[PDB]
Design a protein around this ligand. Structure first.
Ligand code: ANP
Ligand code: ANP
Ligand code: ANP
Ligand code: TPP
Ligand code: TPP
Ligand code: MG
Ligand code: MG
Lengths: 788, 788, 265
């Protein structure tokens, strides 16, 4: 009897459906007189109309039907909204369920509450027109389109009984990120994870053009969505009397198959990739609004996308049409005198946490358990002498991540775009593998590292991975993203969205608990260009992240493996941040042991006393580095200067936290003027060697008292192919150019260092000539060790 | 069957009782090995013991019995703890009920959760030893004793079905604030408010002395507590087998009488002051711990107050006694292997919001509805000419408060220590009256303004009034406190406690929602000394409040009635602050109309253009005032200077927000250096006339670029009796001394203003001589108006 | 019982604010004494049991503490109310580079420990140690006869060297008392700001920046010929702050060498 729809139940569901639309339209238009007790007047209409209408009925259409199956089958559901402009529909149902009144006591279920509820939407000092963090039961802001689908899969991970109902607009489906995220079914495990129920809201139109997926034939539509690995179900029409029963049956069909798929997998009898059920919903745009405006068809057309009538404040004719639109919902039979929904509506409202707007998963910070972090000092490489030993920088991190996975079998995950092996993090493969539910071959047994139980997820689409991870954190869990720095620009749009979400959730919204940080590891830099990656890779992603703020993003550039461990250990505890860690996978020198590394990362920036020779004296120059390749060149330059200028006093400063350079006025995390003057003196030149665009340092540290003595060398440009030393020579960040820069800046070396400066230019000439002759650097360059 | 206790139920209750004690002792002592699976070793004991034990069993003893009646009679209860050092008992029951795990997912109900639960208590980076805001279901921090009782009555207000079980230690009862707060029964309305169930924990001892209330005879104890208006019930003994049944019966007896009292009152058949039930509980201190230590009796003695054995880390003998103490609870039969309580314990655990640790009343900010504030401009007095008309300053505020009460019949209240009539706020009496359930006489009909339905509360004890209001706010409601400035020092201790509570709730605790502000109106100043109040009243309370922070307290000194309205309207919307408004009740000049007043209070500080004559030019001096009496003298001095020095250019600045003077580095609310330099120039003398101790201005504004030109005149001292002008002359804040101060500071007036300065001193001589001759000031002083 | 050595009893956010309230009355009716050790406490109590028309407020701590002055030296110190400690100083016959002043007993210990740290790492640095018992001596003699003269104040605290004042109370109270002095622009007061819920004695001093390590850092910042030369020591001092906080969060108490610190030299 679950598939069939009772006429009595059909009426109450239809009653809820119209009331949700009525509240949605009231939010768009009304600022006063919520229930039409008195004739509508221009003083009740909002001056500026920013809400969108063409998607609201469809979202409410599915939402009321989703609540039906929760009441019947006791399903645990989440609502993820593709078109973020359909916010009124979600809020209206949130208010109808009673969630919004509990979260916001001002907007009660009354006439006075409705006046506040209607006036707040898309209003200065109110709430936005998208699924902002202020929305109860919202994890995804659909303002930027293409990421709703991935967030459904991310939230589904390690939530076996959860079902995430993600509604997808046809226009959104034309975007690149969402077209590739359909293949996320291959990495979702039916045994341990929940289900995603994709609903294609094929209203037929974008803002102003028809959606191609609508204008592509039905046969090719089913062909496209079986090739994605889904079992597609089609509900088409325009008359709700037929569509109420038809749609209810389809949703009943889908849930049984989802449970049948999960029952088959968890029993172990069918350990294969299943054909997940997906719904294709073709309904008119602006479904229950005006039919035509000014002789142009509006309903079921792109003209209904935002607002069918935007001149209602001007001419009374549309004003009467607006009031006629509102009364078509028959609000008199939907709300009582007080302003609450009628008891028929309250009957079909789910109860407590079973409500999709009050599910604690959406406010994931309440479901967040801190990771049991093993002591990273067990994985710290031994550094008996600083800078005299070489070890692979990322491998200790891989071993540390291995022990985190061991102690957090479900709460932690790894995400990587087919680069985990290249990034040299294979230590995690010793305890787990990579997720794969596609076809398997015996050749995968040797080094495939493929298993459905794996805690590491791999796909070449960087958009898919970022959406997977962001949803995983917002549901109250932990993760770590590792990728090349060359392709970081691909996810720049997605990072902005998540940073937006975190910043609002901290300051504006008070009831949203903190979630875990977004930890990103840019594992291959632009200085050590390996085989893969384009020639002109740029560090520009770092500039984009620092663009957001110091109070939501953190940038770490640890010099060695022990600093990488301390940084990763520190950032696996921080909550409301986007942590971007820039480290290189090549074999590098090691500088700090576990104790010294931990103190260094706690400060974020500090003097290296072994690399300095200014103890108990005023340094003639401060050499600072931020990175690992540039740190090596800065250290090598320091060694050269001390050989040729024994009396020269050099203070070596290494900075790991980029944002420490900002003054404490901008953010509390930054250094004070006294602290900054202690590290970098008030009047001596600073030769800063930065892994990135040099101006980023100037943007951060322009307010310092010694900024006029700050001289930053960083990434400028590249040739087609360069050796590691030649590439550093092109950007003037190599050891020889840095030594020349120190000679130019130190006042008592311009006259005295001329002969050394000529010798340094000779070395630049010799190494370039050798590079063009052999294709690599000289052995003494590759095996350079810290002297002294 | 509710009164009698079943043996099966007695066992489960006793099982819960011991488990709560066991967790309490574990928190005090253990940092590792929560369940005694392995022999106790010194590495499991906490290094420093800061918890208190002598009160923990008593609190848990009542708590388990309170949960009994919640499960039986479905009562809505709150736990308010007198002795705040009994925090472990509350936390243990909070953990047992499951509340703590939901709020804190790290401290789960397992062995691993218990390890975190035990290690956190009284630990660096953990939680405190008192009922801090981090405690679930806590409104009152009992660290400072004497205010638990008043907070019970405050939370009870306008919560008719709530019952607040407040446990009171006998030592606490010796304090002044709690002895007088027993009479709060007379102001609690059984018809509209809930009940308070006072439980006297008469353990017989303080920290080191016997409690007098224990050593006073039982007959005189019952005599004392019937004189307070309570029906006292006595439960005495030391054997829990008898005391379990006896005390269950007594609690059953009390609830029925409380419901009978409420049933009689709400039916209207008995509208008299009832004899509320109160429990006197005499149990040994350190009830279930060691009997004797080193030959000294510990249990049932002051030696058990904090820690019965504090050398357990030193000698193994006490270490074995400690482990013997833990095993007396028989933990093997109380927790399973995993670390959760046994299913017998879970049976008697209340469910959901019926749990006293998860009652949403305690986290009152979730229950907070913003006040429907009428437009204050309806009550604004007309000021056609600034400073040329006189009106009573506080009466418009009384009318505004009247309209707030009208639109907020239950959410708002007034609190005053027998000064509302004196403060001239009688406009509120037009709609409501004052609470009184004592004897009534026909003489009260004329101007008594007494009724049980009143929204204004009056009692001469300032301590109990402050406790009433703080609890009212922390339960999610609104209020306004009006009192003299002379007696503000009385509540200084209480204000510190509430400010402490707010500051932690904002920064540390994340799940506690904001509550309404604490609004205090110091309605009678020290300059206009009326009949009542001692001669040497000081403004020192203002200095005490500014000690706390600019981020939790705000000080407002509005000059006129319209500024008082804007300030009160602004502060009735702010949430997490202690707002202290200093205004005077006397007839004063009016300076700003509704529009100009609102702009002024929005800035908090700004130039008065009508009182200035420096438009389009650099002012020779800046005259600033903060208050209303000192504003009049500053204005009168400005008038004198302009009459005698027509070329002199004076900028008049009035400051309402005191904390705007602090630089923006300390707090965002403060002015920037550019903004401050705009109001007070970078190089001209500032003659600041402050209502308070002059050093407070220097503390706030010492970092400003022009602080070396800041010259503050304020309250120094008083004589026995002075006229308003003579008192200002003694403190050198009158118009004549201010004009002299301007002459001294302006560089081009030292030579040129000598003759005027002599004339000004003549006026000081003349007015003092007239004051000693007549006892009042001259008519031209009392009726001074702004010229020009 | 002071607020720095938080005992079992008492609320977490106890404040020294009562001292500020008393100083609001006058120097001619109230006296505030903060004796550093037991002998100084005896002389103060003996002196105040003879005075007639005053409110004497004596701030002392009950915990086990170091002892600094014997009966003869203690009595001379209380008679002055404020004086140089010659054993804790190393500037005899020379101009001190910095004046370290303390007012209290816990803050005196941290001020002494900071002095010991500075002398170990900067042997050439000359430090004058001043201890304050009578708070109101800091007020100039113009306000009250009991206060020090300008010449007397300049002798203790020089006219041009930085003063690192470690006060048991709100730091602004020192500025209210001694704003008129010729060297007030070089007076840098560290006192009670705020507390956490529960702290170890060293951690609580670290939160308020009155511990030995923060004071040593403050001296490095203020002394003109140490900004360049003391950078490496300042980094080491911050490492000690990091290490002791980490140990505090790990064990719940301070390290044994902190609890059993003695005056070297
Ligand atoms: N004051 C500044 N504000 C912003 N960006 C700056 C500033 N000075 C330099 N830069 C940037 O820093 C990079 C190179 O300049 P800089 O780091 O100052 O090295 P430099 O050797 O000192 N060059 P110059 O300052 O012209 O002598 C470029 O990206 C510049 O745009
Ligand atoms: N720098 C300061 N710090 C603290 N309090 C101060 C300071 N300067 C002045 N005061 C206080 O302010 C009051 C009077 O000083 P002030 O406000 O500067 O006016 P004034 O006429 O300039 N007196 P003066 O500074 O001595 O010439 C007294 O109560 C002083 O204690
Ligand atoms: N002139 C002053 N008048 C009143 N209080 C002051 C003054 N100067 C500093 N303070 C207070 O002293 C405390 C710390 O400042 P201070 O004692 O001068 O040490 P400091 O390290 O020099 N701080 P700063 O002066 O801002 O560089 C704060 O609580 C200030 O409010
Ligand atoms: C890549 C991209 N191009 C354009 C837009 C502008 N935009 C915002 S909402 C929206 C409508 C999405 O179309 P559809 O999925 O059909 O949504 P619905 O019909 O449900 O409104 C568009 C085009 C966008 N957000 N992203
Ligand atoms: C006015 C005051 N004096 C002293 C103290 C110190 N103090 C803190 S807790 C406490 C014990 C309270 O005694 P009692 O009510 O007998 O408590 P219980 O035996 O339940 O611990 C004391 C004296 C205080 N908080 N307030
Ligand atoms: Mg569309
Ligand atoms: Mg007691």
């Amino acid at each position: 009897d679950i598939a069939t729809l009772s006429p009595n139940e059909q009426a109450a569901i239809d009653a809820w459906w119209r009331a949700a639309n009525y509240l949605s339209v009231g939010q768009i238009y009304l600022r006063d007189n919520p229930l039409l007790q008195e004739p509508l007047r221009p003083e009740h209409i909002k001056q500026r109309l920013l809400g969108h209408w063409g998607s609201d009925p469809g979202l409410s259409f599915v939402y009321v039907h989703l609540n039906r199956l929760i009441r019947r089958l006791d399903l645990n559901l989440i609502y993820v909204t593709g078109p973020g402009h359909g916010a009124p529909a979600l809020l209206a149902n949130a208010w109808l369920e009673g969630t919004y009144s509990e979260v916001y006591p001002n907007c009660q279920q009354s006439t006075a509450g409705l006046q506040q509820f209607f006036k707040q939407f898309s209003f200065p000092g109110g709430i936005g027109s998208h699924c902002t963090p202020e929305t109860p039961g919202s994890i995804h802001e659909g303002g930027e389109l293409g990421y709703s689908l991935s967030h459904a899969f991310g939230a589904a991970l390690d939530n076996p009984d959860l079902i995430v109902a993600c509604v997808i607009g046809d226009g959104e489906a034309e975007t690149g990120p969402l077209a590739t995220s359909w293949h996320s079914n291959k990495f979702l495990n039916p045994a341990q994870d929940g289900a995603v129920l994709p609903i294609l809201h094929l209203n037929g139109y974008k803002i102003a053009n028809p959606t191609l997926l609508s204008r592509i034939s039905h046969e090719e539509l089913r062909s496209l969505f079986i090739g994605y690995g889904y079992e597609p179900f089609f509900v088409e029409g325009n008359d709700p009397a037929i569509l109420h029963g038809v749609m209810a049956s389809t949703l009943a069909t889908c849930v049984q198959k989802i449970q049948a798929i999960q029952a088959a997998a968890r029993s172990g009898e069918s350990s294969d990739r299943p054909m997940w059920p997906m719904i294709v919903l073709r309904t008119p745009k602006g479904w229950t609004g005006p039919a035509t405006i000014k002789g142009h068809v509006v309903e079921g057309s792109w003209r209904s996308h935002q607002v069918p009538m935007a001149d209602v404040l001007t001419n009374p004719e549309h004003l009467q049409l607006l009031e006629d639109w509102l009364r078509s919902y028959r609000p008199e039979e939907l709300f009582d005198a007080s302003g609450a929904p009628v008891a028929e509506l309250q009957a079909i409202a789910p109860i407590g946490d079973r409500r999709m707007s009050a599910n604690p998963v959406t406010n994931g910070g309440l479901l967040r358990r801190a990771l049991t972090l093993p002591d990273f000092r067990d994985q710290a490489v031994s550094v008996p002498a600083p800078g005299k030993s070489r070890a692979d920088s990322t491998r200790p991190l891989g071993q540390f991540l291995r022990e985190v996975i061991r102690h957090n079998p479900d709460n932690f995950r790894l995400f990587g775009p087919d680069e985990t092996a290249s990034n040299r993090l294979d230590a995690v493969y010793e305890v787990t593998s990579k997720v794969w539910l596609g076809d398997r071959i015996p050749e995968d047994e040797d080094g495939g590292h493929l298993s459905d139980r794996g805690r590491v997820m791999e796909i070449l689409s960087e958009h898919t991975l970022e959406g997977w991870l962001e949803a995983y954190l917002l549901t109250g869990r932990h993760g770590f993203f590792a990728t090349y720095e060359a392709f970081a620009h691909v996810i720049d749009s997605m990072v902005n969205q998540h940073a937006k979400w975190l910043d609002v959730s901290k300051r504006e919204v008070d009831w949203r608990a903190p979630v875990s940080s977004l930890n990103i590891l840019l594992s291959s830099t632009v200085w050590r260009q390996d085989h893969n990656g384009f020639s002109h890779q740029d560090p520009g992603f770092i500039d984009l992240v620092t663009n957001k703020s110091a109070r939501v993003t953190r940038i770490y550039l640890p010099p060695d493996a022990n600093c990488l461990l301390s940084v990763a250990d520190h950032c696996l505890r921080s909550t409301d941040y986007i942590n971007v860690i820039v480290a290189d996978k090549q074999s590098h020198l090691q500088y700090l042991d576990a104790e010294a590394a931990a103190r260094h990362c706690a400060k974020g920036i500090g003097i290296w006393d072994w690399a300095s020779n200014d103890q108990g004296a005023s340094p003639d120059v401060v050499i600072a580095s931020c990175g690992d390749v540039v740190t090596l060149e800065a250290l090598a330059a320091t060694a050269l200067l001390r050989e040729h200028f024994p009396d020269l006093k050099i203070r070596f400063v290494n900075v790991v936290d980029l944002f420490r350079l900002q003054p404490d006025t901008e953010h509390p995390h930054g250094l004070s003027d006294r602290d900054f003057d202690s590290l970098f003196t008030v009047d001596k030149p600073i030769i800063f060697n930065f892994h990135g665009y040099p101006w980023l340092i100037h943007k951060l540290a322009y307010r310092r008292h010694n900024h006029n003595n700050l001289h930053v060398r960083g990434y400028k440009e590249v040739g087609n192919i360069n050796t590691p030393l030649e590439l550093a020579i092109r950007n003037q960040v190599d050891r020889f150019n840095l030594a020349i820069d120190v000679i130019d800046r130190v006042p008592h070396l311009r006259d005295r260092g001329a002969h050394v400066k000529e010798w340094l230019k000779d070395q630049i000439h010799d190494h370039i000539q050798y590079a063009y002759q052999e294709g690599i650097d000289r052995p003494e360059i590759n095996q350079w060790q810290w002297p002294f």
